[PDB]
Design a binder for this molecule. Sequence first.
Ligand code: HEM
Ligand SMILES: c1ccc(-c2cnc[nH]2)cc1
Ligand SMILES: [Zn+2]
Length: 367
Amino acid sequence: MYDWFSEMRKKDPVYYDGNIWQVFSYRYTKEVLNNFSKFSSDLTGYHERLEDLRNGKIRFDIPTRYTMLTSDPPLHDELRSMSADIFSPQKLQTLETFIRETTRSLLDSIDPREDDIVKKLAVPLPIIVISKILGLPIEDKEKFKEWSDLVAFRLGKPGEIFELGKKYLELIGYVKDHLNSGTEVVSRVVNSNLSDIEKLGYIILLLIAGNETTTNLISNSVIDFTRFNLWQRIREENLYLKAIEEALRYSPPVMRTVRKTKERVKLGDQTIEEGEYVRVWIASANRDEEVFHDGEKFIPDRNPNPHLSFGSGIHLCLGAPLARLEARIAIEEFSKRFRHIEILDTEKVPNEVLNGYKRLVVRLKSN
Ligand code: HEM
Ligand SMILES: c1ccc(-c2cnc[nH]2)cc1
Ligand SMILES: [Zn+2]
């Protein structure tokens, strides 16, 4: 993928293939993401059917079609403002203890002889933490993951119709049946002027949408640090914070996102007409030579590091601070308890939008 990205950044930064437009450079990728007035996120019919949702004419529908992720202003802020401080520095600080204790416990279940860290650590951590933060109970652990997988899948394909399967129905039932136990943020959404469908969509987004991406950040970090033999230096120079950002830039959990033009727009040397879909390749922008010197090289102490892995503009990842914290703690604690790491087997998640691992089997030394 990266040799292709490179060639495109050089010859066709903004390329039209007759179906959609694709952007590969940092400059333009950032331009699209920030210019919400001309590059819309309204790709799931949220704005068009908002009215029939609010007045109740629409009763059965896909909740995830209606979240802030696929809304433009002013609806966007009306939604985001309700949870904009859900991961406040003060709240996160209080959670560090929970996250650390949790991480320590997950690490204790690992059999050093041979075990899958995606299963034992990368997958569990985010679920346990978001569950704690939102107040929604972890019961059937396999179902939680199933929901994590399906939601991430759908979010990567905005506008593509998919009927509510059994699993999704169980997800919806679960949320409906546990809203009462929800915390502050959840109560604010439940007691708002949003239609039921929206409340369900909003809760699903907060509770499940960030699990697979954070899991991938953790998995990708382990892989990179190991591939490039950086563990020793990271511990020694305390590059955790910087090295995790390099991991976000070098191996982004989300490879790209989507936008639609609302009007004729000039992007680079190209002119894009109205109603066109624009695939923004975050993964490619993150390696742009202009912005990141020696961009194809992993530099653990790279700084500053303005990667676009959390996006940019009004939709900048609401969960960025939490994802960063969980990743930092998982990596920090992992490096301390384990002396050496040997990767025995790996299996990648077959997906174009999400970049991570389904299995990461390793052999470790303690102390
Ligand atoms: C390392 C993991 C993560 C990555 C790389 C990631 C990436 C992103 C990106 C690129 C966007 C913007 C997409 C666009 O502009 O179309 C975004 C939006 C968002 N993310 Fe994440 N995310 C991560 C973790 C999380 C977590 C932990 C949560 C929540 C528990 C979360 C919640 C959200 C929400 C709600 C939005 C919508 C923001 C808005 O539309 O205003 N993310 N994320
Ligand atoms: C596809 C695209 C984005 C996401 C996401 C962003 N933040 C949390 N999940 C998940 C799947
Ligand atoms: Zn229950």
